[PDB]
Design a protein around this ligand. Structure first.
Ligand code: MG
Lengths: 98, 151, 114, 127, 100, 82, 206
RNA sequence: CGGUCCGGCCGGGAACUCAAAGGAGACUGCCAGUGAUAAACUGGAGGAAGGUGGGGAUGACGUCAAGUCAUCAUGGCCCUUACGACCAGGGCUACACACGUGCUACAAUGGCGCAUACAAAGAGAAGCGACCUCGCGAGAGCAAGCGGACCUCAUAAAGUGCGUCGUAGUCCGGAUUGGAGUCUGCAACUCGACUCCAUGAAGUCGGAAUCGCUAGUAAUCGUGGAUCAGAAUGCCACGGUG
């Protein structure tokens, strides 16, 4: 019914946010199927460390794209309202598929 | 290695018979990593030898190897300008391997139409002591014999 | 046996025999075989003259051997006196298709001189 | 009774489900000669069974994901061993001696930076 | 790169912004099989006449901070070196000096 | 190489010039920077000075020229010998 | 010249992220550039007032920027109109309406960036460089820094050859990843050339 | 387990690979000998893991006035109706050569034809593009789905199962040179690939010399990606044999 996806670059922070979301769900609404971590989209970015020459030198970087899905197959009027405004995501991109 | 002396990795026996030596031979034959082709070739070679000799496939393999393996092997010492190629007692572990390698080389050299057939022929030659690997072994021994003088 | 200008070694398989003739190759050979109704497995040995004739006709239908060479040679000649990039390359003995002439142009050039 | 066995080799993940009696070998809804091509691989898969005196005594329903051919076979073998361990957990002495309980630390070493392969340096002129 | 270079691409970008739909429609009809031949011809010459700077082909994407076209990145929009510099300062979210 | 469905290259200016020449009946050397143009049946008889980099070289248009571009006939690179 | 940039190896370990926002690949680069521009603007504006670094966070397309400063008396000013004005320009730069938060750094000499800035200033108004460096280190020690390494490079005192000069006091564990190494660089635009002031300050072990 | 299109497909089942959060867990801790009674060493057991378990990031003092003042910033010196800028094309792809570095080769462990097996890791809404249709085919139309473990790009290829050819310059290798077409983009002529037809150069393991690699390593087969309208034998990575 309602699929809420949580997207952040830091893992601990994402976990925290997920927990917060779960808490929000539990109080106001019903059911909730908790946190399910989806495979980390690892953005392998290789950068030449030197501006001029030096092929052997490469700085190897990675963006950890963390995905968290909390699944609820039950809509309540109280909780749908207190989720769009009551979330406190801070640095997490929350996508609520209604 | 300058420092490390380690016990070597375990190699599993041959599927058809149950031989480590056979597996080693197959490995020696194989390059690029194509083991299953090499293994098949080896099997084919064994079959033809059995068809010819009328003996056990492994036993025949063994006596051929025996016929091509040396007891003494030369090794360079490089102390002076002149060659100090000292002969040394070869361990039974690596001797076998060397023989196998020689056999493989001989097979490679040979000009029969199937590679399996080539190596079968090589085996046959070894059994009757007349092939290329055996010849190589002979002169190696001769070389050692000549310079067995050194210690 | 003569199929389109030049002679063919009788030992060979169908697909390969046709290839020996200038202008026709493997796919061409296959096509010819399909047109005929015969498979590639049969050699020049074990073939009736009638069967051969059809094959020959089919080969003729395609621009083959001498005529094709003439067409190509004539085209080359035309290019030459036109004097385009294609033409001067031909005149010089240098790559046309888009190769590095600096290094590895050795097919059109041949062996190294100095 | 049903028993589970997990299998790993290089990149492969294998499941092994063991049930006593009848004696069946099933790999992804197929037989061993049906599913696997190489004889060596088959032998290796049979290898843990081979040591012990069990032929028709247990059925094996197995599913394998990832890996290769020989690697896959190895993973399967590992899974089987795990299952066997789960079944008894007293005949480990033989297995350890054999070298079957250990999952390969021999694994995909990553392609390196500035180097042509995993350990291979690019062929270079000294001067 | 040079300031001039930066200016050039800015101009090109602006042109692209202006001309795209007009460009797009022409492309569409060029593609179309069910279309008049004379009309197609007309479209093609229009395209030929219409600016080269308006084309996304002339759009050589540069560093949005400095101006370097070489070592561009669609994630960050910057020079490789510049990205690294940013990253180390902590100025990029996600990008870790990581291992796998 | 382009698709025949898409349509081979013609520059407008040069086409116009060609048309003028045809109407005019003057022919003679005609200046050309844009080397991408395909040779047309109306262009046969006209001499066209194609830009090769430093200089314009006049190449006479023939019937053996239809499926070609002008800049191919322009020796855009120059070489004598080592 | 060789080593890792310490702030970039510790960004997911001990150092909190300077950039704290999520954006899609479609909308990442531009956002980053905007952030950079804002940073630049801040640098331009509050160089005379003592600033160190800023942390950027944008939830629900409404940015909150955290500013790490030494003295709030000049940074905020006497009234919150200047702050509002500043916000406006940030908003203009970015797109969406802008909000900011200010943070006063406790122990200004514990933070490296401020110290570096001070050093740069000293260099500019012509003081003995070595002596200044020494003074800085002493101050840091007084303040309770467990370790401090400073490093200046090149064209020192108008010499025809570059001068690499560095002072090290206490313990500066650059290799310990669980160490709180606060590292910053300020590059002096002097009359004789460019002097690069590098500074690591070891705060604590966690 | 019940139920059936014999599809995980499903009423269901949350058991387990999986997934990634929090951890346990490997420490010379355990047994012995050696050894100054110590550090420690050489073994042994248990144990998934062994003496740093593997790999990576990690580069102290500093060297070479090492590289870059064309990422950036810079002290200055100079051009300042020109050493400045805008456009158009040419080029940077030249070509008697000399070298370096990658790739395909010389064959039957093979080449190809015809059946068939195993993935891993990626990348995507001015995007990927099932299904159906037409094209030898690259690709088109047609029309769903997926901000994407769901939709896709992509069938992994070696391997296996048959068939052949019978060591030839070969059914090796595919170069080059031409022809017929398809996308991409304002536009492939210098100057993109690719679909195809032909064509069949050198080369039958390479002189002196030299180079990499200690185990999932080399060797070797494929699969991605990043810069890309467009274009990798490079590079970064993922996996198969081994
Ligand atoms: Mg050479």
């Amino acid at each position: 019914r309602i699929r809420i996806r949580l997207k952040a670059f830091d893992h601990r922070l994402i976990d925290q946010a997920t927990a917060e979301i779960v808490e929000t769900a539990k109080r106001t609404g019903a059911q909730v199927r908790g946190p399910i971590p989806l495979p980390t989209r690892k953005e392998r970015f290789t950068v030449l460390i030197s501006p001029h020459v030096n092929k052997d030198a490469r700085d190897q970087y990675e963006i950890r794209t963390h995905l968290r899905l909390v699944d609820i197959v039950e809509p309540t009027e109280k909780t749908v309202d207190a989720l769009m405004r009551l979330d406190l995501a801070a640095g997490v991109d929350v996508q609520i598929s209604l | 290695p300058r420092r490390r002396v380690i016990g070597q990795r375990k190699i599993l026996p041959d599927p058809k018979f149950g031989s480590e030596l056979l597996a080693k031979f197959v490995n020696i034959l194989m390059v690029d990593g194509k083991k299953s082709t090499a293994e098949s070739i080896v099997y084919s070679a064994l079959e033809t030898l059995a068809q010819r000799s009328g003996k056990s496939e492994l036993e025949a393999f063994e006596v051929a190897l025996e016929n091509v393996r040396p007891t003494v092997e030369v090794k360079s010492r490089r102390v002076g300008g002149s060659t100090y190629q000292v002969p040394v007692e070869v361990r039974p572990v690596r001797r076998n391997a060397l023989a196998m390698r020689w056999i493989v080389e001989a097979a490679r050299k040979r000009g029969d139409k199937s590679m399996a057939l080539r190596l079968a022929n090589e085996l046959s030659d070894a059994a009757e002591n007349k092939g290329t690997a055996v010849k190589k072994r002979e002169d190696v021994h001769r070389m050692a014999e000549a310079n067995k003088a050194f210690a | 046996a003569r199929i389109a200008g030049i002679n063919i070694p009788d030992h060979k398989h169908a697909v390969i025999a046709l290839t020996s003739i200038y202008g026709v190759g493997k796919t061409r050979s296959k096509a010819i075989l399909a047109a005929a109704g015969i498979a590639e497995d049969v050699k020049i040995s074990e073939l009736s003259e009638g069967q051969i004739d059809t094959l020959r006709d089919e080969v003729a239908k395609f621009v083959v051997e001498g005529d094709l060479r003439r067409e190509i040679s004539m085209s080359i000649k035309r290019l030459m006196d036109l004097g385009c990039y294609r033409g001067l390359r031909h005149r010089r003995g240098l790559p046309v298709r888009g190769q590095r002439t600096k290094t590895n142009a050795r097919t059109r050039k041949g062996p190294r001189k100095p | 009774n049903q028993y589970y066995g997990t299998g790993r080799r290089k990149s492969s993940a294998a499941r092994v489900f063991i049930k006593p009696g009848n004696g069946k070998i099933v790999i992804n809804q197929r037989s061993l000669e049906q599913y696997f091509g190489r004889e060596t691989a088959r032998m290796v898969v049979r290898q843990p069974l081979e040591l012990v005196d069990m032929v028709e005594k247990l059925d094996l329903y197995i599913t394998v994901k990832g890996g290769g051919i020989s690697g896959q076979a190895g993973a399967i073998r590992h899974g089987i061993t795990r299952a066997l361990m789960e079944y008894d957990e007293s005949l480990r002495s033989e297995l350890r001696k054999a070298g079957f309980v250990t999952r390969d630390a021999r694994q995909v070493e990553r392609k390196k930076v500035g180097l042509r392969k995993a350990r291979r340096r690019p062929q270079f002129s000294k001067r | 790169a040079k300031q001039s270079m930066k200016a050039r691409e800015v101009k090109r970008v602006a042109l692209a912004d202006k001309y795209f739909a007009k460009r797009a429609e022409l492309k569409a009809i060029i593609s179309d099989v069910n279309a008049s031949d004379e009309d197609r011809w007309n479209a093609v010459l229009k395209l030929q006449t219409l600016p080269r700077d308006s084309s996304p082909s002339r759009q050589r994407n540069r560093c949005r901070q400095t101006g370097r076209p070489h070592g561009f990145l669609r994630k960050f929009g910057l020079s490789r070196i510049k990205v690294r510099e940013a990253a180390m300062r902590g100025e990029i979210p996600g990008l870790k000096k990581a291992s796998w | 190489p382009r698709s025949l469905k898409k349509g081979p290259f013609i520059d407008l200016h040069l086409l116009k010039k060609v048309e003028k020449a045809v109407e005019s009946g003057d022919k003679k050397p005609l200046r050309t920077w844009s080397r991408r143009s395909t040779i047309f049946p109306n262009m046969i008889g006209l001499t066209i000075a194609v830009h090769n980099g430093r200089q314009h070289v006049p190449v006479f248009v023939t019937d053996e020229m239809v499926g070609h571009k002008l800049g191919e006939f322009a020796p855009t690179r120059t070489y004598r010998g080592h | 010249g060789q080593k890792v940039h310490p702030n970039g190896i510790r960004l997911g370990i001990v150092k909190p992220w300077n950039s704290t926002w999520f954006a899609n690949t479609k909308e990442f680069a531009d956002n980053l550039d905007s952030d950079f521009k804002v940073r630049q603007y801040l640098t331009k504006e509050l160089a005379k007032a003592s600033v160190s670094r800023i942390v950027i966070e944008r939830p629900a397309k409404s940015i909150r920027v955290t500013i790490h400063t030494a003295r709030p008396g000049i940074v905020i000013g006497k009234k919150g109109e200047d702050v509002e004005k500043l916000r406006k320009v940030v908003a203009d730069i970015a797109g969406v309406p802008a909000q900011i938060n200010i943070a006063e750094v406790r122990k200004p000499e514990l933070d490296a960036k401020l110290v570096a800035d001070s050093i740069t200033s000293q260099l500019e108004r012509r003081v003995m460089f070595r002596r200044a460096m020494k003074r800085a280190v002493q101050n840091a020690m007084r303040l309770g820094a467990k370790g401090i390494k400073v490093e200046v490079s090149g064209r020192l005192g108008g010499a025809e050859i570059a001068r690499t000069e560095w002072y090290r006091e206490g313990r500066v564990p650059l290799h310990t990843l669980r160490a709180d190494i606060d590292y910053n660089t300020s590059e002096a635009h002097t009359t004789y050339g460019v002097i690069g002031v590098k500074v690591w300050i070891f705060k604590g072990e966690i």
